[PDB]
C-alpha cells in the first residue's frame, strides 16, 4: 500500500495514462500538460526519486503508434518530452536522446540538472556511436552541446563538459566561454587528463589548454605547457607575446632548467639578464650560495664516505698496502660524485698530480674527468684548473682532462663557447683516447644545443672508419644528445646511413649498440615519426635489426605512456628462448621509458618487473635492474630498494652488478641512510670481488651525489615536465650497462659521466624582482588532492615551516607560508621570484 | 603489493582514464605470464632431505654441525646439521625441518608461532595519510621531529651526534585525532606498525602482562624499523599492574640498547599519569591535542564532507561557527548523520538544513544533566 498523499499522486499518474488510450485531443494537450507540470515539479526538485518515475514502470509502451503518426505539433513534442524525461530511468539510452531531439527543444535547465547531465552523457555516447563517414547528424548533437557546456560551467560542472568535449573530440570550443575564476578547474583538469589520453588527442588537448591559458594571460604556465609540447617555436611565440619583464625572466629560468635555449634579438628588452638566465651560467653563483647558506661546503672524502675509520677493517695490515687500480677508480668516482658542483676538493686539489700518479690505464681517462664534476658550472673555475693537466706529461690523464673541460660546461651555454674552441682542434686527434675525451666533453658541453656548427663538426666522424669503433659510438651519442627529439633530417639521415653500412662483425661489436640510440635521441617523444624511419631500419639484419628498431621506437615514445607500444615491447619481452636475445634486453628499459611519465604507470611497472624477474631469462634478468633504476631516479621508494636488495646477492654476477648500480641510481643524491646502510653491508660483504666493491662504492658515491643537494631526475615542474637532455643523459648510461662486464667494468668507465647531462640540483631559492636572494618562510611537504576532486590539487600535506632556501626531495612541494608575497609563477620549483602584495593590506 | 591510489573521487573521466590505464597494465601482466637447469643442486640437497621432512624445535647447538632438537612427541635428539643450513638463522626456539628417518637438521623454517602478537603486527596502516588529517600542524611537526625524521633521516641526528628522542606521549580530549595521527605517521614512513589497546595488556595471569609487553618489544625489534602504539595508556598508566609498568619503563629506559623501535602512547587523562611512566629521560615529547578551532574545524568539515554529494545552499561557516565545542570525531558524526537524514527524505545530495539539524541533534546527544 501507499500513504494518502502517495496514493493521490499514484492515482493521478494512473488516470493520466488511462485517459490516453484513444485519439481525443483532450488527452494530448491537457493531460500531457498536467504530466509536464507534475514531471517538471518532480525533476526540478532535488528529490533523487521523482515520484512519477517510480510509478511509471507500466510505461507508455501501449502509446507508440499514436506517438509516431500524430502531427509533429505541440502534442508530439509533449509526448516525446515526457517519454524522454522518463526514459533516463528505463533502458532507453539509445532512444531517450531521440525523444529529446524530436520533442520540444526547450531549455535543458527547465527539467533538471540531473536530466541535463544524463542528456549530455547520452550526447557523448551517440557521438562515438555515430560513424565518421558523415558529418550531418553531428549538428543535432551540437545543437545540444552548445547549451549544455555553458550550463555546466554555470553549475560548477567543469570536468563534466571537459569530458563531454574530449569525447566528441572537439576541445576547440572550451577556449571561449570560461570565467576568470572557473578557468583554474578546467585547465588543471585537462592538465591531469593529458597524460592518459593517447596520441594525437593528448597534444590537441595540450594546445587547447595552452590557448585557454593565453586567453587568460597566464604566460608562465602557457610556456610550461608549450615545453610539454616540446616545440621550441611555440615557446618562442609565447615568449615574444609576453608583456612582463620579470615574468619573462622567470620563464627564462624555467627554460634554462628545462635545458632549452633560443636566440634573442636586440628588440628583447633587458637583453643581458634574459640571455644569461636562459643560458643558466648564473647557476653556479646561486649554487655556491645555497651550499654555503647550509654550510655543506667541506668536500667529503671517499674513504670517509666508506668510513673505514669505524668499520672493522678485516682487509688491512699487510693486505692493504697497495694503490690497486680498481678501488682507486672507485674512490675517484666517489670523490667526483659526492663533491660534485661544489667547486673544491681536499683530495684531488692538493694531491691532484700525486693521486693521478697512483692510478693506471683507463682510470686516468676517468679520474681526471672526475674533477670536471666537482667544478660544475664554474667554467672559469675548472677551466683554470684543468690547464695543469691540459699539458700533462701523461696522455690518458690528458684524455680525461680534455673531457672534464667539456663536462664543466654541461648544462650552461656561453656566448664565447669556450669548450667548442678548446675541443675543436682535438676531435680528429690521432690518438684514440685524446679524440674520445675531446668529443665526449664537447658533446656534454652542448647537449640539447641543436646548433649545426657543432653537429657538422661531429658528423664526419661517422664515416671516419679509421677512428676506433667506440669513437663512432661516442660520436653518435654526442650527436643524439646535442639534438634531442628534434628529428632534424641533417643529423637523422646521416646517422641512418652510418648505421646502415656496418657488417656482421661490426654489428655485433660492443660499442655499435650506441649508434641506434644516437638516432633515437634525435626522435625523443615524437612517436610515429619513427614509423617513416623504421622502414629503412628493417633492411639491416637480425638480431641487431630488432635491437636498433626497438630502441629507436622506445625513444620515440619515451614518457608517453603509450600502452600499445608497451604491449608491443612486452611481446618483444615475451619471446621465450643468448646474444641474439639482446634485443629483448633493451626492450626491458623500454617499459621504463614509456611508463616513467605517470605515477600509476611507474607503480604498475614495478609490479610487472617483479614477475618479469621471476620468469625472465638472463638477458631480461640483467636488463631489469637498469629499468628499475630509471623508474625512480633520485626517488628511493622502499618497495624498489627492498627488491634491489633481495636481488643484489644473485649468483648471476651481472644481475648483481646491475642491482648494485640501481641502488645508487634510485637513491642518487638522496643521501638516504637506510640505502647507505645496505651499501656499507654490501661493501663489507663483497670485499672479495673488486668488481662488486667498485660497483658498491660507485653506488655510494651516487647516493651521496652533491652531498644531498644534487639529483638526476629527468622530470621537473611538479614531475609533469620532462627534460629531454636529462633523459638522454641517463639513457646512454642505462643502455650501455646492458653489457657491464665489457662497457663499464671493462674499458669505458667514462660512460658514466653521461649522467652529468642530466645534472640538476633540487632546491627552492626565492628572489625579489631585482633578482637578489630573498629568504622567505615557506611551507614544505608532500602533494595530495584531498578535498580536491577534479579540481584544485594544492595540498602541501604533513608540512614544515622552512626559511628559504630549502632542498626539495622527490615528491616535495612548497607553498608561500604567508600571503604577504605573490610569486611570479604559481609553480614553486627551482629559482622563483617574488613581489610584495599590494592588494594585501594591514 | 597493492593497487595505485586513484585520486579523483568525483565521477569524472579522469578517474576512468586512470582506471583503464591500470587495466592495460594488469592485462599486460596477464599476457606476459600466459605466453610461457639446477637439477644437480636439487638432486643433492632436496634428495638428501628425502620426503617427507618433519618439523621440530631447536633447543641448543653444541658443535659446528651438531645440535639438540625436540619434536612434537616431546622426545629429545642429538642430531647432526647438514652444511647447507644457515647457522646464523638457527637459535633456541627456532622451528627446524628434520629428515624423517635420521632426524638430521635439514633447514630452518620461517616462524609461524606466537599467534597473538603476530595478529597485532597489523601492518594494515594504509587507510589514512597525513592528507586525511587537517589542521594538526604543530602536532605533525612535533611527531615528525620525534619519530618520523629519525626513521626517515637518522643522518641528521648521527651527524649531530644526537641520540634521537626515544618516547612520545599524545594527549587531549578523545576524538581529537591522536589515533588517526599515529596511524598516519605509520603510513608516511612504512616502518612496521604495532598497536595494542591499553587494558588489553592487563591480564588475569600474573606473568601475562609483563610477558606480553616483553614479547611485543621482542617482535618490534625483530621487525627492526618499527613503531609501537599504546592507546589509552591510562588503563595501565594511572603491585601486578605496577609491575607491568615497571616492565614497560625498563623496556624503555633500561639495560641493553633498544635501537630503532619508536613508541607512541596516547592518553585521555594525562594529568592522572604516574610520574614514573612519564620519564623525562625517555618521554621528552608530550604532544597536546586541543579541541579543534575554527580553521581546524573548517578543514575537518571539508575533509569529511568532500566524499559526499553536496547541494549549493550549504553554508559551511554557520556549521563552523560558535565555539570549540566539539572534536573531529563529532564532526564525522555530524557528517554521517546528515547523510542519513538526507537519505531518509530521499536526498542523495545533502543540503544545509540537513547539517543544521544534524549538529543540533548531536549537541543534544552531546553531554547531559539536569539544569
Amino acid at each position: 500500500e501507499l500513504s494518502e498523499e502517495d496514493k493521490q499522486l499514484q492515482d493521478e499518474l494512473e488516470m493520466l495514462v488511462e485517459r490516453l488510450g484513444e485519439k481525443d485531443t483532450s488527452l494530448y494537450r491537457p493531460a500531457l500538460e498536467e504530466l509536464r507540470r507534475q514531471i517538471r515539479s518532480s525533476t526540478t526538485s532535488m528529490t533523487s526519486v521523482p515520484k512519477p518515475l517510480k510509478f511509471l514502470r507500466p510505461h507508455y509502451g501501449k502509446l507508440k503508434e499514436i506517438y509516431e503518426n500524430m502531427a509533429p505539433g505541440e502534442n508530439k513534442r509533449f509526448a516525446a518530452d515526457i517519454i524522454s524525461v522518463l526514459a533516463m530511468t528505463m533502458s532507453g539510452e539509445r532512444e531517450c536522446l531521440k525523444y529529446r531531439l524530436v520533442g520540444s527543444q526547450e531549455e535543458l535547465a527547465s527539467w533538471g540538472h540531473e536530466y541535463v547531465r544524463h542528456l549530455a552523457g547520452e550526447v557523448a555516447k551517440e557521438w562515438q556511436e555515430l560513424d565518421d563517414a558523415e558529418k550531418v547528424q553531428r549538428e543535432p548533437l551540437l545543437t545540444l552541446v552548445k547549451e549544455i557546456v555553458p550550463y555546466n560551467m554555470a553549475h560548477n560542472a567543469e570536468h563534466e563538459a571537459c569530458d563531454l568535449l574530449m569525447e566528441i573530440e572537439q576541445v576547440d570550443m572550451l577556449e571561449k566561454d570560461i570565467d576568470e575564476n572557473a578557468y583554474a578547474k578546467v585547465c588543471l583538469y585537462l592538465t591531469s587528463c593529458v597524460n592518459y589520453v593517447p596520441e594525437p588527442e593528448n597534444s590537441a588537448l595540450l594546445r587547447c589548454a595552452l590557448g585557454v591559458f593565453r586567453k587568460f594571460s597566464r604566460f608562465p604556465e602557457a610556456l610550461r605547457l608549450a615545453l610539454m609540447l616540446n616545440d621550441m617555436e611555440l615557446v618562442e611565440d609565447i615568449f615574444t607575446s609576453c608583456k612582463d619583464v620579470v615574468v619573462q625572466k622567470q620563464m627564462a629560468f624555467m627554460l634554462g632548467r628545462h635545458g632549452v635555449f633560443l636566440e634573442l634579438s636586440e628588440d628583447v628588452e633587458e637583453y643581458e639578464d634574459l640571455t644569461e638566465i636562459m643560458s643558466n651560467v648564473q647557476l653556479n653563483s646561486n649554487f655556491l650560495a645555497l651550499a654555503r647558506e647550509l654550510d655543506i661546503m667541506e668536500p667529503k672524502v671517499p674513504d670517509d664516505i666508506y668510513k673505514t675509520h669505524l668499520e672493522n677493517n678485516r682487509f688491512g695490515g699487510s693486505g692493504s698496502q697497495v694503490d690497486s687500480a680498481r678501488m682507486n677508480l672507485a674512490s675517484s668516482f666517489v670523490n667526483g660524485f659526492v663533491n660534485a658542483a661544489f667547486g673544491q676538493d681536499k683530495l684531488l686539489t692538493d694531491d691532484g698530480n700525486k693521486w693521478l700518479y697512483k692510478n693506471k690505464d683507463h682510470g686516468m681517462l676517468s679520474a681526471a674527468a672526475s674533477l670536471g664534476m666537482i667544478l660544475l658550472w664554474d667554467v672559469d673555475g675548472g677551466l683554470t684548473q684543468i690547464d695543469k693537466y691540459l699539458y700533462s706529461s701523461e696522455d690518458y690523464i690528458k684524455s680525461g682532462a680534455l673531457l672534464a673541460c667539456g663536462i664543466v660546461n654541461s648544462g650552461v651555454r656561453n656566448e664565447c663557447d669556450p669548450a667548442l674552441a678548446l675541443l675543436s682542434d682535438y676531435v680528429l686527434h690521432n690518438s684514440n683516447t685524446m679524440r674520445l675525451g675531446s668529443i665526449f666533453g664537447l658533446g656534454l658541453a652542448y647537449a640539447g644545443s641543436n646548433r649545426e656548427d657543432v653537429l657538422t663538426l661531429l658528423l664526419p666522424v661517422m664515416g671516419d672508419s679509421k677512428s676506433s669503433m667506440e669513437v663512432a659510438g661516442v660520436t653518435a651519442l654526442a650527436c643524439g644528445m646535442i639534438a634531442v627529439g628534434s628529428c632534424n633530417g641533417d643529423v637523422t639521415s646521416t646517422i641512418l646511413q652510418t648505421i646502415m653500412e656496418k657488417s656482421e662483425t661490426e654489428l655485433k661489436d660492443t660499442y655499435a649498440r650506441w649508434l641506434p640510440l644516437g638516432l633515437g635521441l634525435n626522435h625523443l617523444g615524437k612517436g610515429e615519426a619513427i614509423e617513416a624511419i623504421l622502414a629503412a631500419l628493417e633492411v639491416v639484419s637480425e638480431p641487431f635489426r630488432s635491437f636498433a628498431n626497438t630502441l629507436v621506437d622506445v625513444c620515440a615514445y619515451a614518457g608517453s605512456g603509450n600502452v600499445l607500444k608497451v604491449q608491443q615491447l612486452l611481446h618483444i619481452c615475451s619471446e621465450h628462448f643468448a646474444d641474439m636475445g639482446a634485443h629483448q634486453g633493451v626492450a626491458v628499459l623500454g617499459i621504463a621509458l614509456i611508463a616513467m611519465g605517470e605515477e600509476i604507470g611507474a607503480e604498475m611497472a614495478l609490479r610487472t618487473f617483479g614477475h618479469l624477474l621471476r620468469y625472465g631469462e638472463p638477458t631480461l634478468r640483467r636488463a631489469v635492474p637498469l629499468a628499475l633504476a630509471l623508474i625512480s631516479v633520485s626517488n628511493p621508494r622502499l618497495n624498489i630498494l627492498d627488491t634491489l636488495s633481495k636481488f643484489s646477492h644473485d649468483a648471476d654476477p651481472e644481475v648483481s652488478y646491475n642491482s648494485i648500480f640501481a641502488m645508487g641510481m634510485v637513491g642518487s643524491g638522496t643521501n638516504n641512510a637506510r640505502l647507505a646502510a645496505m651499501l656499507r653491508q654490501l661493501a663489507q660483504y663483497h670485499a672479495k670481488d673488486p668488481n662488486n666493491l667498485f660497483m658498491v662504492r660507485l653506488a655510494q658515491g651516487l647516493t651521496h651525489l652533491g652531498k644531498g643537494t644534487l639529483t638526476l631526475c629527468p622530470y621537473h615542474s611538479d614531475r609533469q615536465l620532462m627534460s629531454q637532455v636529462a633523459v638522454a643523459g641517463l639513457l646512454t648510461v642505462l643502455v650501455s650497462f646492458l653489457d657491464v662486464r665489457n662497457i663499464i667494468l671493462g674499458k669505458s668507465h667514462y660512460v658514466l659521466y653521461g649522467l652529468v647531462a642530466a645534472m640538476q640540483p633540487r632546491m627552492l631559492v626565492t628572489f625579489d624582482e631585482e633578482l637578489r636572494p630573498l629568504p622567505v618562510s615557506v611551507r614544505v611537504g608532500q602533494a595530495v588532492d584531498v578535498v580536491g576532486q577534479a579540481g584544485k590539487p594544492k595540498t602541501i600535506t604533513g608540512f614544515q615551516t622552512h626559511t628559504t632556501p630549502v632542498l626539495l626531495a622527490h615528491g616535495e612541494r612548497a607553498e608561500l607560508a604567508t600571503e604577504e608575497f605573490l610569486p611570479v609563477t604559481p609553480i614553486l620549483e627551482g629559482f622563483v621570484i617574488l613581489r610584495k602584495n599590494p592588494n594585501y593590506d594591514l | 603489493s597493492k593497487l595505485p591510489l586513484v585520486t579523483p573521487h568525483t565521477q569524472c573521466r579522469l578517474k576512468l582514464l586512470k582506471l583503464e590505464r591500470i587495466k592495460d597494465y594488469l592485462l599486460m601482466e596477464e599476457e606476459f605470464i600466459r605466453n610461457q637447469k639446477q637439477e644437480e643442486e636439487r638432486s643433492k640437497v632436496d634428495d638428501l632431505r628425502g620426503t617427507p621432512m618433519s618439523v621440530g624445535t631447536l633447543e641448543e647447538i653444541i658443535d659446528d654441525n651438531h645440535a639438540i632438537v625436540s619434536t612434537s612427541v616431546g622426545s629429545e635428539h642429538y642430531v647432526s646439521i647438514l652444511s647447507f643450513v644457515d647457522k646464523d638463522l638457527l637459535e633456541p626456539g627456532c622451528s627446524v625441518l628434520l629428515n624423517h628417518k635420521v632426524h638430521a637438521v635439514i633447514g630452518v623454517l620461517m616462524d609461524d608461532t606466537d599467534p597473538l602478537v603476530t595478529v597485532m603486527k597489523v601492518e594494515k596502516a594504509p587507510q589514512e595519510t597525513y592528507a586525511d588529517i587537517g589542521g594538526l600542524d604543530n602536532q605533525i611537526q612535533e611527531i615528525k621531529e620525534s619519530v618520523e625524521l629519525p626513521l626517515t633521516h637518522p643522518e641528521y641526528y648521527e651527524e649531530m651526534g644526537i641520540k634521537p628522542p626515544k618516547g612520545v606521549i599524545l594527549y587531549g580530549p578523545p576524538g581529537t585525532g591522536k589515533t588517526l595521527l599515529a596511524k598516519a605517521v605509520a603510513n608516511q614512513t612504512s616502518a612496521t606498525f604495532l598497536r595494542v589497546v591499553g587494558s588489553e595488556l592487563i591480564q588475569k595471569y600474573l606473568g601475562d602482562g609483563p610477558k606480553l609487553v616483553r614479547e611485543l618489544f621482542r617482535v618490534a625489534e625483530e621487525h627492526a624499523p618499527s613503531i609501537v602504539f599504546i592507546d589509552e595508556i591510562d588503563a595501565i598508566g594511572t603491585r601486578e599492574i605496577q609491575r607491568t609498568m615497571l616492565e614497560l619503563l625498563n623496556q624503555l629506559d633500561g639495560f641493553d640498547s633498544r635501537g630503532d623501535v619508536k613508541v607512541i602512547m596516547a592518553t585521555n587523562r594525562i594529568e592522572t599519569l604516574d610520574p614514573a611512566l612519564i620519564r623525562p629521560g625517555r618521554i621528552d615529547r608530550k604532544i597536546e591535542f586541543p579541541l579543534p578551532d575554527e580553521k581546524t574545524k573548517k578543514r575537518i568539515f571539508q575533509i569529511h564532507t568532500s566524499r559526499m554529494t553536496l547541494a549549493d545552499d550549504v553554508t559551511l561557516d554557520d556549521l563552523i561557527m560558535a565555539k570549540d565545542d566539539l572534536s573531529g570525531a563529532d564532526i564525522k558524526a555530524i557528517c554521517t548523520e546528515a547523510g542519513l537524514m538526507a537519505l531518509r527524505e530521499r536526498r542523495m545530495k545533502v543540503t544545509n538544513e540537513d547539517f543544521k539539524k544534524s549538529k543540533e541533534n548531536v549537541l543534544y546527544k552531546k553531554q547531559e544533566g539536569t539544569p
Binding site: 500513504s3 502517495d6 533523487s48 526519486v49 521523482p50 518515475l53 517510480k54 514502470r57 533516463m88 530511468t89 540531473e114 547531465r117 544524463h118 549530455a120 552523457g121 547520452e122 557523448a124 555516447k125 563534466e160 | 565521477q11 569524472c12 573521466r13 578517474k15 576512468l16 582506471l19 583503464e20 587495466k23 554529494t309 537519505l343 531518509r344 527524505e345 530521499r346 542523495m348 545530495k349
Partner: peptide, 28 residues
Amino acid sequence: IRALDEGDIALLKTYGQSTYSRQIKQVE
C-alpha cells in the same frame, strides 16, 4: 517517513548516478 521501498533505493542509486557509473564500477 516511510521506509525505503525497493523501488526507492533503485531510483536513488539510478537517478543520482553520473553518466559514468556503469563503466567505472564494471571496470573496478
